[PDB]
Amino acid sequence: PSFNLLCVGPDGIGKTTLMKTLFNNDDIEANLVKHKVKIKSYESVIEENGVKLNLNVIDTEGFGDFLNNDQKSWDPIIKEIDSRFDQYLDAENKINRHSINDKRIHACLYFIEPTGHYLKPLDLKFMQSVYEKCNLIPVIAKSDILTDEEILSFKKTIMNQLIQSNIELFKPPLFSSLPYAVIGSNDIVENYSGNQVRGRSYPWGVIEVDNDNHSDFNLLKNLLIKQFMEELKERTSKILYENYRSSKL
Amino acid sequence: FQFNIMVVGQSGLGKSTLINTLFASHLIDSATGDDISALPVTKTTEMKISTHTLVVRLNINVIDTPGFGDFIDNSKAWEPIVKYIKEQHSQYLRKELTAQRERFITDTRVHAILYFLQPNGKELSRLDVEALKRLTEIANVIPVIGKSDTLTLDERTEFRELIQNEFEKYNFKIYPYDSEELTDEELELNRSVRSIIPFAVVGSENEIEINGETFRGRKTRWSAINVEDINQCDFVYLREFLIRTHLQDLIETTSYIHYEGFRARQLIA
Ligand SMILES: Nc1nc2c(ncn2[C@@H]2O[C@H](COP(=O)(O)OP(=O)(O)OP(=O)(O)O)[C@@H](O)[C@H]2O)c(=O)[nH]1
Ligand SMILES: Nc1nc2c(ncn2[C@@H]2O[C@H](COP(=O)(O)OP(=O)(O)O)[C@@H](O)[C@H]2O)c(=O)[nH]1
Numbered sequence: 001p002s003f004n005l006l007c008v009g010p011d012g013i014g015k016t017t018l019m020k021t022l023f024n025n026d027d028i029e030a031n032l033v034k035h036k037v038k039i040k041s042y043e044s045v046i047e048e049n050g051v052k053l054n055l056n057v058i059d060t061e062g063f064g065d066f067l068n069n070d071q072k073s074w075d076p077i078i079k080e081i082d083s084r085f086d087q088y089l090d091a092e093n094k095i096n097r098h099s100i101n102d103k104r105i106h107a108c109l110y111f112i113e114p115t116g117h118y119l120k121p122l123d124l125k126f127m128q129s130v131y132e133k134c135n136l137i138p139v140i141a142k143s144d145i146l147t148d149e150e151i152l153s154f155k156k157t158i159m160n161q162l163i164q165s166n167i168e169l170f171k172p173p174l175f176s177s178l179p180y181a182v183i184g185s186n187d188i189v190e191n192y193s194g195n196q197v198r199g200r201s202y203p204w205g206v207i208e209v210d211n212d213n214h215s216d217f218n219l220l221k222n223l224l225i226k227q228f229m230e231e232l233k234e235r236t237s238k239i240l241y242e243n244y245r246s247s248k249l
Numbered sequence: 250f251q252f253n254i255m256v257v258g259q260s261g262l263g264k265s266t267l268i269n270t271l272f273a274s275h276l277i278d279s280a281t282g283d284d285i286s287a288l289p290v291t292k293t294t295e296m297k298i299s300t301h302t303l304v305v306r307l308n309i310n311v312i313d314t315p316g317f318g319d320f321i322d323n324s325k326a327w328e329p330i331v332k333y334i335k336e337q338h339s340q341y342l343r344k345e346l347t348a349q350r351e352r353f354i355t356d357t358r359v360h361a362i363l364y365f366l367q368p369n370g371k372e373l374s375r376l377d378v379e380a381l382k383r384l385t386e387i388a389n390v391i392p393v394i395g396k397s398d399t400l401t402l403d404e405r406t407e408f409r410e411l412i413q414n415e416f417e418k419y420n421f422k423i424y425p426y427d428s429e430e431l432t433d434e435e436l437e438l439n440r441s442v443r444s445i446i447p448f449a450v451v452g453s454e455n456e457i458e459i460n461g462e463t464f465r466g467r468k469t470r471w472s473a474i475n476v477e478d479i480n481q482c483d484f485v486y487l488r489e490f491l492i493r494t495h496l497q498d499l500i501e502t503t504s505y506i507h508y509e510g511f512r513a514r515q516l517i518a
């Protein structure tokens with residue numbers, strides 16, 4: 001029972017914090033299995049739906065931080081996706097098959113900087129090379145800094161850009177709210193009612209992870225973990241992996 | 250009375266909003282806006298110059314740098330900026346050396362650079378190191394944390410201390426400069442301002458209402474920011490530093506440090 005989740009975004013955008021928030025665990029990145037982007041693979045055991053689940057979070061270092069962020073610089077990410085497909089394919093083709101350990105990536109979270117403006121040329125290029133190989137889920141990182149109106153306007157611009165570039169997002173059989181405006185925090189803070197809640201505390205207010213009125217964190221949690229995890233795994237297996245296999249032959 | 254201020258930083262760091270908040274008027278639009286097609290077709294940094302008259306009486310050029318860090322390939326991002334700053338010095342030197350000099354030479358030299366850092370808690374990126382190492386030597390560079398309301402107070406402290414160590418690690422000249430001509434009262438003013446550079450700024454051209462009280466800032470599903478509250482952000486210190494306390498020193502150091510250095514290098518080449 002495995003789940004492999006890829007986080008793509010510039011350093012400091014909030015990837016690790018969001019992972020600790022989603023899985024309600026501060027040790028998600030404790031076991032690391034081992035010119036260009038570097039790939040960090042962390043393995044973790046999380047109980048979900050009452051059963052045990054082997055979580056693998058894949059992370060990037062240095063994405064977007066080079067002078068020239070061309071395809072060569074972030075190609076390690078695509079090679080990692082392909083390699084996990086290639087491992088499954090080799091295991092499937094072995095004569096002495098054994099119960100296959102499934103490392104294929106089941107979702108790619110793409111972390112968009114909260115500019116309020118538009119998707120950058122690098123965001124479009126990367127997402128165009130990935131969406132046929134992973135379930136692509138874009139999110140607006142650190143969305144607490146955005147006004148309610150900026151979120152609406154920014155989401156609209158992003159969606160139109162993705163349509164124009166023919167980038168196909170994951171769609172549950174939620175979708176109208178993509179990209180999700182998310183916040184991250186696995187830390188407890190006191191709010192104005194005196195309650196202990198997960199969130200971030202500033203002189204200008206307290207934002208609450210688990211508050212549906214403050215961000216789309218719960219929509220993302222529903223999509224990844226609580227409601228549609230199996231749909232993510234099935235589209236990886238039945239559609240994306242199968243397209244990759246057939247394209248090799 | 251001329252004052253030429255440049256803003257440098259990736260699109261959407263609040264550069265145009267900050268300028269408009271500093272001068273309490275809508276001087277400039279965002280250089281790119283919500284339109285990706287507004288990025289320069291040349292795929293390089295371009296200079297965007299606008300001219301303004303404020304009150305005491307003050308003639309201002311605002312120079313924006315659309316395209317800086319916005320493209321896939323940013324390996325020449327700072328060179329049009331460097332070229333523009335140096336061109337202003339070259340123009341002034343040309344005018345100084347003419348035989349029938351103009352009695353009053355117009356000063357188009359860049360007097361201040363607001364350099365916008367992303368509030369990502371990280372050390373200086375390769376892009377910032379390359380641009381800062383060149384810009385700090387030809388203009389008064391004032392670093393600024395863009396959209397600094399990203400950070401809690403604790404994160405702000407950690408980030409500002411990290412950036413100041415980066416400045417020392419690379420030995421950047423960062424405004425304000427101390428000199429032996431300064432009195433003990435002026436050095437202490439410099440020391441206390443320097444301790445909050447990069448400025449943690451929040452910008453806004455809109456007024457919001459908080460308990461009937463109207464001030465300008467930002468209001469959301471969870472947040473209310475008063476831009477003119479020194480307990481919330483450093484906008485008020487930046488404004489006083491730029492426009493009142495160090496305005497004249499910014500103009501003077503442009504002349505007797507940056508332009509004189511440029512001029513001496515030109516006259517021996
Ligand atoms: N404003 C805001 N800040 C956040 C949010 N989530 C995380 N941060 C902060 O942003 C900084 C980056 O957090 P990380 O979780 O380490 O981000 P990262 O993407 O893992 O970056 P790396 O250090 O390269 O691994 C930290 O100071 C976080 O506290 C958020 O939702 N809103
Ligand atoms: N959180 C936050 N948002 C800001 C701030 N200043 C501007 N914004 C918003 O951020 C977006 C981009 O700002 P803008 O001034 O156009 O950035 P520019 O492209 O660098 O000129 C706009 O939606 C602004 O309303 C700020 O200090 N904090």
Ligand SMILES: [Mg+2]
Pocket residue numbers: 015016017
């Ligand atoms: Mg991390």
